[PDB]
């Protein structure tokens, strides 16, 4: 929108695409990066919406719209409560969670009934000195834990193929994510403190979360797919009629050339 501020990336579009390509742990083409980074190719302006403020929504209308979303079905109240607590945009939070959980269907999101948690201070190494486990802690009953964003769920190795599940379920237990409501609050906290309301990072639009405006901070980006911010903005468009007011502010990237 014309009523938008601009954030200078301070390098050319071409230089920025080349920095993203060389820093990404996965290999994507210049072409794939260019069509998602170039702001003139954005069809969906919601990737530039400032999400660092709570915006009122029709809560019952949101619960109704979350029709067939697995563990997130009907959970309008939990999403609005979480967004209000962290002063973030609730339609952004809904869209972020829907994308990250596959519409409420991912293993960690649907809930894992664990009978033990990891002690990460007591790792266990194989013959080739590679990590294969941790000394585990008995729980007095089976506990169902939820993790929407796989927070704490550090990468699987060939020799530890369930590492993300062990650490994702242990992190969820240790945060008290024993309900979908508490897991939604945990997801909102993660994006708020780390990205959206960080005074150091100021990653307060979907575009900025994926494509850091400060080239020195390129390591601090939420995801690696080139289309990540575009995918979440497309989900937000599905829900955009649920706002109760017309208080929208946008921040658009600009490049040196």
């Amino acid at each position: 929108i014309g009523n938008a501020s601009k954030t200078n990336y301070g390098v050319s579009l071409n230089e920025y695409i080349k920095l993203q390509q060389r820093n990404n742990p996965s290999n994507y083409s210049y072409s794939e990066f260019e069509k998602y980074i170039n702001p003139a190719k954005a069809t969906n302006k919601l990737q530039f919406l400032r999400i660092d403020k709570f915006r009122s929504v029709n809560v019952s209308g949101l619960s109704s719209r979350l029709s067939n979303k697995g563990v997130l079905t009907g959970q309008g109240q939990a999403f609005v409560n979480a967004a209000k607590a962290f002063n973030i945009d609730p339609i952004y939070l809904v869209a972020q969670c829907l994308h990250e959980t596959g519409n409420g269907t991912s293993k960690l999101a649907k809930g894992v009934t664990i009978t033990e948690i990891a002690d990460e201070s007591k790792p266990i190494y194989n013959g080739n000195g590679q990590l294969v486990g941790y000394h585990m802690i008995k729980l007095s009953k089976p506990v169902t834990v939820y993790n929407l964003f796989g927070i704490g769920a550090k990468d699987n190795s060939s020799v530890f193929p369930n590492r993300a599940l062990i650490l994702g379920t242990t992190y969820a237990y240790n945060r008290g994510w024993t309900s979908i409501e508490n897991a939604i609050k945990g997801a909102a906290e993660f994006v708020s403190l780390n990205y959206v309301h960080s005074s150091r990072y100021s990653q307060n639009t979907l575009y900025k979360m994926r494509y850091n405006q400060n080239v020195s901070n390129i390591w601090h980006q939420y995801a690696t797919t080139p289309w990540y911010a575009s995918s979440i903005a497309d989900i937000m468009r599905s829900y955009q009629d649920l706002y109760l007011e017309n208080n929208f502010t946008f921040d658009v990237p600009v490049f040196a050339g």
Side-chain angles (χ1 to χ4, degrees), residues 8-46:
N8 184 28
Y9 273 52
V11 300
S12 74
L13 180 51
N14 176 70
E15 288 307 342
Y16 192 83
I17 295 152
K18 295 162 85 162
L19 291 174
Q20 291 295 331
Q21 185 176 60
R22 75 189 284 179
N23 281 281
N24 199 307
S26 309
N27 299 319
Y28 296 103
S29 63
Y30 186 102
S31 196
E32 301 171 89
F33 275 120
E34 186 276 341
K35 79 164 271 211
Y36 291 103
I37 295 172
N38 185 343
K41 291 187 169 184
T43 53
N44 188 339
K45 65 196 194 274
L46 297 178

Side-chain angles (χ1 to χ4, degrees), residues 2 16-17 51 69 71 82-83 87 120 131 136 142 151 164 183 239:
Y16 192 83
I17 295 152
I51 54 176
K69 304 309 216 242
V71 69
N87 191 26
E120 191 170 359
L131 181 66
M136 299 288 120
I151 303 161
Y239 291 86

